[model samples]
Target chain A: QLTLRALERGDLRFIHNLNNNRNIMSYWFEEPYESFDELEELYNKHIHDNAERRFVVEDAQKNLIGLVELIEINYIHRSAEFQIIIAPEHQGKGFARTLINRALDYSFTILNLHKIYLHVAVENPKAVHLYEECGFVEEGHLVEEFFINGRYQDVKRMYILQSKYLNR
Target chain B: NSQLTLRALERGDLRFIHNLNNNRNIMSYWFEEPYESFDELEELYNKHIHDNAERRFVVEDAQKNLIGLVELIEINYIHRSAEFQIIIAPEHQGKGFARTLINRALDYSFTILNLHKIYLHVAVENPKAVHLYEECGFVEEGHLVEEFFINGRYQDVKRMYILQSKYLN
Candidate 1:
C-alpha cells in the first residue's frame, strides 16, 4: 500500500515542516530549526551529489507518509546508512515496519547494497525492539554518542546484512 | 627531526591501541569516547586480524618505540577509497610525528594500496590538525553538525578528503 519516490524540490515544504518539529528532530538528534533558504541551498548543493539518496514515502492514495534517506552510500563497501521519519499524524497506524521493510528491499535488490545500518537512541527501547523484529542486529552500543538537550545519550548501532535478509 | 617509519600493526600492539583508546583527551579528536577496555580492544583485534577491509599500522621512531597508531578502515577496493584515523601518542605530539605519519600513510594509500582517495573526520574545534591536513593537500568536503559527543557536549566535525591524483601530483 506504500511506494517510494525520489524527493523533489517541491517536497521541501513537507521536509521543512518535519525538520522544524521539535519532537521529530529530537529523535533524529538534530537541531529542531532551519531556515527555508538553508534547506533550499542544501538541496541545490546536493542535487547532483552521488553520496546521498533522499526519498519520500507515499501511499497508494498518494499521501506523503514520511522521508527515507540512504546516505553515505559506499559503492565499494556496498553499504549505506538508513534514516526514516514518519509524519506524526500518520504514525501508530502500523506504517513504520512496512516502510522500513520496503526501504530494505530497495537497498538490497535495487541498490544491491550488502549492508544497511542505522543509529538509534538507547533510551528508545521500543524502537530498538521494533528494529530487532525487523531483522537488524545490534552491532554496538556507543556510550554518550550524541548530546540531546542537556544530557548525553547513548546510541545503538544496528545493521542488517543482505545475505541474512534474503535468506530469511 | 628524528627518522620515523610506519610498520604493519601486530597483535601485540593492542596494548598501545588500548592506551590510546582510553584517553579522553586523545579520543576527543578522533570523535570517540575513551571508554574501551583492553579486553574489548583485544576482541576486536582478533575479529579484524585478517579483514581486508581494514589496514592497521603503527608509527615508530628509528629506535622502535611506538609513537602512535594509524588505521585505514572501510577500505573499498571498488571505490578505491578509505577512511583514515590516526592518533599521535599525547607525549609524542608536536614532535612533527603526526605530519610524518600522515604523509607516509597517504603515500601507502595512493601508491601501495592504489586507492584513489583517503578521507578523515576531525572536530572543527581542532584547527591545528585541520590545518595540518590542509597543508598535506586535503580539502574540506563537508561540515557535519553535532557529529559526535565529546567532552560532555556535542561537537561539529569537518570531513576532509584527498584524492590520489591531487596527492601524487
Candidate 2:
C-alpha cells in the first residue's frame, strides 16, 4: 500500500535519507549533502515558502519513501516540469508510478497545467524507460552534457502534454 | 515536393542563418549561448567547412535562397559511426524539408561513407524534432539532465541513434 501527502517540516529526515543515499544521489543530484541538518533546514524552508508543488510518498505505515515535485510552473503557458526520486530500496515496486500518477492528477485537474516535462540523465536507463512507459516522449539530448565524477555524461529531455496524457 | 540540394551561402544567407542560429526559439534546444555577431557565424562556418571532413550543404529553395544547413560531422571509420547537425530557417520549417535533408544525408552517410551508426543530440523540449527523428526510425539511446546551458539556465538532452542494421530494415 502507498500514500502520498503534502510534505511538511517533519519530513526532512525522510528527504535527507533519500538525498544522502549515494546510489540515489549519484545520477539525480550534482553533490552530496554535507549533513542531515542542512537538508532539514532546506526542507523546512521549502515546506513553508515554496510556490512550486511538492509531495512526499509514504507506505501504509507512513514511512516516507519518495519525493516528487513540479517546479518551473509556466502559468501563462499552462506547463511545468517535474523532478522525482524514489528511495533505492523501495524502487521497482510501483510506488513511484502510483505517486507520479497522483501528482499528474493533481497537476492536470487542480493546477490545470497543459503540459508537464522532465529531464533525466541519459545514463539512467531505468528512469528513461519508466518515463516513456508513463507516456512521456523524448524531446532532445545533449552530448557530454553533464560533468559527474570527473567525466561528462549525456542527458535526455522528455515531456508529456496534458492532451497527450489524457488521450493515452 | 521536398528535395535536397547544396548551394553557396550568400551574404544574405549568412544573415538569415545567423538569425536562425541566434533565435532563442530555434536554438534554445541546440546550444548554450546564442551567436552574438557575424564574426561568430563566420568562424563557425570556416571551422565547419574547412577543418571538418564532412561537407556542409546549404539548403536552397526554388528561388535559390538559403533555407537551412546540414552537415555530417565526427565520422569514425573504424567504429563505423558518424554524427550530423542541422538548423532550419524558422520560417521554412515544418514543410518536410528537414525530413528530406535528413534522409538524403542518411543515404550518403550509409552508402558513400559506409557508416554503421548515425547519432545526434536533441533538446528534450523540442517535440517536433523528436517526432521527426522518431518517424525516421531513430531510437532514443540515452538521456542526460542539465546537459545544456541556455538562456542562463540548464536543460536536458536526449541522445538518439540509428544502427545501420535497423536503417537497412
Candidate 3:
C-alpha cells in the first residue's frame, strides 16, 4: 500500500508543508519556518549533489504520504544518515515501519552502505523505541547538541550496521 | 625555523591537499577515503569556494610551505556551531606544531567567526591527538561507537567540543 520515489520539483509543496510544521521541525533541529523560495533555492542548489538522496512516500493512489531521506552518504565510510517524516494526516496508519523498512532496503541492498544512522530527540521516546525495534542500537547519548524550540534538547544517536540488518 | 601561520585555502593548494588526501594511512585517521582525484577536488573547490557555511585553511611556515590542512565545516549559524578538522603532515609530527595549529584554528572559530561551539571527532585510539585537543580546552562530549570503517575494522571516535565561553576564559 506504499511506494517510495525520487523527490522532484512537483513535490516541493508537500515539502514546504512539512518544513513549516513547528512540531515536526523541532525534532529535526532546524528552524520551524522556511520560505517556499528558500526551499526552492536549496532544492535547485543540491539537485545534483551525490551526497544526499531524498524520496517521497506515496500511497497506491499516488498521494504524498511522507518524506524519507538518506543523507550525508559517505562513500568512503559506506555510511549514511536516515531521516523520515510522516505527514500528520498520515500518522497512525501503520505506514512508518513500512516506510522505514523500504528505506533500509534501498540503503543496504541498493546503495550497499555499511551502516545507517539517525538522531532521535530524547523527548520523543516513541521514535527511539521504534528505531530500536528496527535493529538500531544506541551509539551515543548526545547532550544539548541541538538547540531548538527555544532550548537545548538531548538526543540519542543510533545506528544499524549492514551485517546486523541483513541477519535480522 | 619560522613560526607557523594559518592562511585561507586557495585553488593553488589543491596539489598539496591531493598528496596528503591520497595517502591511505593519513586519510584513515580522518575517516575519509584516500582516492580523491585532483579533478574531483578541483570541482569541489570551485563548488565550495563561495560557501559561507564552511571555512578551509592551510597551515604554513614562514616560508609558506604547507604543513597541514584545517577545515571548519558544517558551520551552522543558527546553531552557532561548527565541526573542526585538521591534518598535520607526517613529517611535522611531534615538533610542537599540533598544539599551535589547534590554537590558531580555535581562535579563528571562536574569536573571528564568533561561533558558540566548535566540535570535532577524533579516533579514540589516537591518544596523541586526544591529548592535543584536550590541551586546547576541548572536553569529551560523547563517544561514538564504530563510527567509521578504517584499517580493516570499524573505529570508535571520541566527540569533543569547546564552547566560546570556555575557550576565551
Mind giving the per-residue lDDT tens digits that candidate 2 earns over A88-154?
Answer: 8876777667777788888887887777778788889988998888887776664444444455466
Native-interface RMSD of candidate 1: 15.7
What's the residue-level lDDT of B83 in candidate 2? 76
lDDT by candidate, in order shown = 0.76, 0.68, 0.80
Order the numbered candidates by TM-score, best leading.
3, 1, 2
lDDT of 3: 0.80
Tens-place lDDT digits, model 3, residues B1-169: 3389888887798888888765645342212223357886777777666767668898899887778988887787777889998888877767888878788888898889988888899999989889889988888877787888778888999989888888898
The prediction achieving the highest TM-score against the true structure is: 3
Model 3 regions more than 4 Å off:
A22-33, A37-49, A60-63, B22-40, B62-65
Q: Each candidate's chain B TM-score?
A: 0.90, 0.78, 0.90
Model 2 interface root-mean-square deviation: 10.4
Backbone clashes in model 3, listed as residue pairs: none
> Best-fitting candidate, measured by DockQ?
3
Among all candidates shown, the one with the greatest lDDT: 3
Q: For residues A60-161, could you state the per-residue lDDT of candidate 1 as single tens digits?
A: 889988998888776655678898889888888888898788889999988887788898889999999999999987755654334465554767778887
